[PDB]
Ligand binder design. Structure first.
Ligand SMILES: [Ca+2]
Ligand SMILES: [Ca+2]
Ligand SMILES: [Ca+2]
Ligand SMILES: [Ca+2]
Ligand SMILES: [Ca+2]
Ligand SMILES: [Ca+2]
Ligand SMILES: [Ca+2]
Ligand SMILES: [Ca+2]
Ligand SMILES: [Ca+2]
Ligand SMILES: [Cu+2]
Ligand SMILES: [Cu+2]
Ligand SMILES: [Cu+2]
Ligand SMILES: [Cu+2]
Ligand SMILES: [Cu+2]
Ligand SMILES: [Cu+2]
Ligand SMILES: [Cu+2]
Ligand SMILES: [Cu+2]
Ligand SMILES: [Cu+2]
Ligand SMILES: [Cu+2]
Ligand SMILES: [Cu+2]
Ligand SMILES: [Cu+2]
Lengths: 299, 299, 299, 299, 299, 299
């Protein structure tokens, strides 16, 4: 029961509390479990998943928070969670430091402070590297800027901070470019944004004309060197890794990312004729094989 | 029939008039035609073309112009023109909106305002996507900045506006990186800039060293993930998508683009010894298979 | 023979003298020689080398120096040295200009002024292009900025000028990403940083926590379109081609480069827990096949 | 353009003059140009040619003549002319000695005295060797014996000196055995004598019964180790390389040649019943694929 | 059926009579018949044969004889007999002259004067060429010199004329090098002299020490470009095509022949220690696959 | 270990003694041993060798000498030495006669009188034939003519008899054409003269112009049917097997040999312009893969 339509706007913000220092603490529970997933109606893929879904839960925190991820391995192979983000070596989720890999039946709690602000990700780093990523163990990790730490860009920070009135004006979506090699010969058969091939052709993403749009776009695609995003009929600002509050690229319509790269796209359909506006990879075969969608811009 | 040496400096600026508001109107005529093209002497490729040539005509307009492209399909398969540019959904040249695909014998007029300024392209977007681009349906679309709209970068803007005395000082060239899969197994056999393999090795591009050089560089290569440009013995400024009037990358000699990406390169051979200065893909096999040329810097 | 641990910090600065004009002169001796190299214990590769090592010697000069490279070919095939840098056409090291290719038994002196400051490279450009690069004829070429020529970024420039006290505070490493196709079918079997697969897993690179780190990172990998660099648990500033004194990308942890691209990475492990901090390509299979290493952060 | 029937008896004897020493000078003009050639109706091959034809012009001079060949490269790849004959090292047409390869736009004059008398050839010797020969850069070079220098064999010498009454009685043909690999996988698809498969089946070579026949037979076929000539219903004398005035083999009907070998065949159909007399490779598949022809013996 | 030991010394000399003019006439009857042959015990090959054997009957006549070969096709495909020898075009046994191909149930008489003396062969020349030869339609054709016509070489002529007392002193053998492609993919599986793989290893050829040896050696091997003969521990004189009475090559132990070539080998084991003396192709795999035998030199 | 430059002129002439009859005895010690050889720097080939080198020692004796070759097998597989020369069956080095094969740890002394004079070779003849030759078990065997036995050609014989003043005036070289199948699929990857690919491009063979040149040329190449020798810019006389004192072929520049064939080439660069003069296989791919060298003709 994975819903690629609910997934677009679903932020896991954790079990929240306040540490005695005043620092906010966000706790998450993540279980690695072997599970069937469906990448097109009637195409089943044997996944290794975080919390039973591919991509894993989108974790969204604020710059400066204390993050605790309680990780339990209920699968059949050893796994980790490697975060893209600042943290100690022993919290890195690689086989050779800290606890090492987390074996079936074992549990381990990752702890770190949420730095730097931007758009990040997490994925398994086991043996061999490409196998555990391909099987499904990846997800989005978003660290909102703390507007009080960035007075020179306060308005931009507030528009990214989940729950502010500025942020509520924005239509924010998370999008993970992934692919699936169904016969396990290291070449992808199926491509997608958020797992389900052509999911947003069957059901376009509804966009209010008068509100700006922000995409947190992440490349999790294995085996292929790059993936890309082309926005039809409109241009966006791109923020590489989302780690700056001013754009990396102003006014582009096609960007590319290798695996592990990611960023923030901001654009607006304000004043456009209502209708369907396509977005897809500019690797033509990826689009043909499932990585193509529509925005539905409404009055 | 196709001349890669004339193509370098050929701009189609259309039939000009004015709308009652005073907005400038530019009108173009484009016909899809199945046609033989020659990619090396004695290598014939069965192309789908705009106006009988690959790449199609370079269309060049001013920021804010109203553009009308009368499109007629005189071929055997349905086709479109998808512009990289701001326009309404019904004008997007995709199968699912407006008039959909344009079938043999049919016509349609694409109409939009020319935004944003920069270096862009157009190409077919039919079914399947990779087949119609590979067969030859792509071309360059340049939108000159309007200097009145950019007072803070007026000199930079005037140097890009076709016809000003500042623009006449520059030596401007169009370069489309393409490739050809002559046995149709989805792997290119021939690579080129402007279609004819090694055309600018056979006859180098003559460059007056006292005037600066601007290249509008577009990647239309299908099947391969990236293409690139290495300038020998010199460095250029790179403007990604051409959509800013300040450089994206200062002082580089090798840049890469996935398909659909493009940009502007600016450099000068002022003070250099006269001679041959090579430019080519830094994917070594591409350069060996045709994507290599020479500038001839003259006293 | 080749010591990948010593290579990290080895700078070849030449025989120094003064031209009549007062310009500094730096002279180097490079011999091409066919030689066995070891890319893993017991894996021998039949290489074409500069001075008997792959990568070739790292040449490091100052912006504005006069550079003379006395090149002798002691091999069995014709070779050149093509520098990425500003120089006359006849000094470009390509087959069709100046002296042409340097055949076995021949000698030629490449001479030019060292511009522009940045992180660069040199490699053979013979026939066909991919064969001579793959076989091992590539090396790093670093042009330090002259701080007297950059008053607005004097401190940034002095930290890059080899030998200043500011520069001695930095821990600088040169890293060439390369690959080896041991059965010569144009797909790599082994990937590495600095030739020896997993060299820096076997013996981690020791990093003092209290001092910043600079990496001159170069992509010499053939056949594959891109290579990349992921820093675990930390973020870096990226200077594309090293040709600016301000960062191209602020605060990233994954960058990619096509072949011939290169840049400077700057980061610090100040304040971090001591331990092992991984770095590797984010093309997962490259990392599995040798392009993976550890920094050892010490108190 | 290419006429294999005219080619059989076409001799380029140069522009003739006398040097101050009294020595005869013969000058030739040869241009390398990329061009389509037709190896069978509707089979187009992308060729590299000398003067727009494959095989190149048949050059015929006299023992002791001074030969000047003005060579110009109007193609896109570097090329040479390597003559099989006696000449200085700097005139040998190999990479790396003398001028080396002649790059696009360059010119060079090959100059030597014509020795030794016999049947020879010329072909490109660039990198790699097999590519430039296969692409079409080969031709016949015939040095007639000077009858005054061979008093013991004066009648045989006079019969080979072009234009004497003894020579006019002989029917002389040049035949270049060649092949074409149209999908460029290093295995020939088409075989022929003088390029056009089965040309002399479609139109037999008319032979006058009462006049002897001389063939200058050259093997330019690439990739295959040997080619051969079988004369039906008759026997010939064979002169290996044509360098002696008495036969190498008396009364044979099948000879073989590796590439670069060549010789003179002499036979007579005097007394034979008029009709069609076949000649072809005795590699049966070569004959099936184009290397088969007929002599038409008429009363 | 086929006896390779009897084949060695079996000469078919025809039905002899005298024409009114006094010229000797020799008549032969040859039937093309489809038949199994055994090329190794238990390896059955579907052959097309002359008179039910592969090789066909060895025909041996005298220079100047009138030869009449009555040919009848009892097979299922059309066939010819193409003699290597002098004859009218209408008697050449090729599809396009005379009676053309002889279809099933048809007949034709080949008629010619036996010229020139030497070692020759006959084989089918139908469509396609390689198929009919490979299937088995080839045989030896020997024309003895008439000693009256060769007074200068009368002893050598007489030693070759079948039946003279000088000829009886010689040990004369016919040997046809052939091969078989049992899965019909155009590459031989089996090689032999006289069809049966290793027949003369199983049963060596008995050689009297005190008498010289002569071999009529013919290459009928299809698909492979050359075949060869190496005589162990001894040297022989080679007569190319047998068409001269003086050796082509003196004192050799390895000769090669393309298909259709053939000749005469003469040697003596006089004074040699009795024992086994090997002879085989010097293409090693041919020897391994059946083309290897022993001479048994007896006191 | 192996030195291809010293190998060119190294003659193993044996330990000499006098038999009671007065006949000269030349004894040689040859050990078969498995050893690595280097066919290019970093290309290691697992060889079966005579005395630790490929080719084996060049043995040079005089016609009529008694030769004893003490052969010991220190390898892992059975081996022999089969000489191309006259000798008894029991001394012929084949599996079925005399001692049979020499198994690991066994020894055998080959003995025979050295006949006939000429250029010969020796090689293993075990099971299967091609595998032991390819692995490296072959060498040159040269029998000088005894001038006292050839009074009609006494001058030619003295110039071949090693050590005479006439022989000192000749420049003599031994060249074995060989090849290597490094992945053991029965097709060669590397070709050479004297094992090391392009050895004489790296270091040309120095040739004086006032002395003529003699090459003992041997074809040991497995798998391929023929190999060849082309001399640039000059012509030579060829002596097939070297078994005559007059040439087989006068004035040729390209000869071919199947495996086990060999001969003597004589030429002179007297009066030539000093320079580099190429020599190589006219099978273009063999030359590209290592069988190419230069003569350095000096003033
Ligand atoms: Ca508190
Ligand atoms: Ca797959
Ligand atoms: Ca108006
Ligand atoms: Ca293809
Ligand atoms: Ca490989
Ligand atoms: Ca040179
Ligand atoms: Ca082919
Ligand atoms: Ca077969
Ligand atoms: Ca092989
Ligand atoms: Cu895992
Ligand atoms: Cu990662
Ligand atoms: Cu289309
Ligand atoms: Cu596009
Ligand atoms: Cu090189
Ligand atoms: Cu480069
Ligand atoms: Cu060429
Ligand atoms: Cu040649
Ligand atoms: Cu037949
Ligand atoms: Cu035949
Ligand atoms: Cu052996
Ligand atoms: Cu042998």
């Amino acid at each position: 029961g994975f819903d690629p339509y609910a997934f677009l706007t679903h932020w896991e913000t954790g079990e929240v509390s306040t540490l005695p220092s005043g620092q906010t603490l966000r706790e998450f529970n993540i279980v690695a479990v072997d599970k069937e997933i469906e990448i097109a109606p009637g195409v089943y893929f044997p996944a290794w998943t975080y919390n039973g879904q591919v991509p894993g839960p989108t974790l969204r925190v604020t710059e400066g928070d204390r993050v605790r991820v309680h990780f339990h391995n209920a699968g059949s192979h050893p796994h980790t969670i490697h975060f893209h983000g600042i943290h100690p070596a022993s919290m890195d989720g690689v086989p050779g430091t800290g606890p090492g890999m987390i074996y079936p039946g074992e549990s381990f709690t990752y702890e770190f402070d949420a730095y730097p602000f931007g758009c990040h990700l997490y994925h398994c780093h086991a043996i061999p590297l490409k196998r555990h990523i391909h099987k499904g163990l990846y997800g989005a990790f978003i660290i909102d800027p703390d507007p009080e730490r960035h007075p020179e860009y306060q308005a931009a920070a507030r528009a990214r901070l989940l729950g502010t009135p500025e942020n509520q004006a924005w239509q924010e979506f998370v999008m993970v470019m992934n692919g699936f090699d169904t016969n396990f010969d290291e070449e992808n058969e199926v491509y997608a944004v958020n797992t389900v091939a052509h999911a947003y052709m069957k059901r376009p993403i509804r966009i209010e004309r008068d509100r700006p749009v922000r995409i947190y776009l992440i490349n999790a695609t294995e085996f292929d060197p790059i993936n890309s995003f082309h926005l039809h009929a409109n241009f966006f600002d791109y923020y590489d890794h989302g780690t700056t509050l001013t754009p990396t690229l102003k006014t582009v319509d096609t960007i590319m990312q290798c695996q592990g790269q990611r960023g923030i796209l901001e654009f607006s359909f304000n004043g456009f004729e209502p209708g369907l506006y396509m977005f897809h990879a500019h690797q033509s075969e990826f689009a043909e094989l499932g990585w193509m969608g529509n925005f539905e811009v409404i009055e």
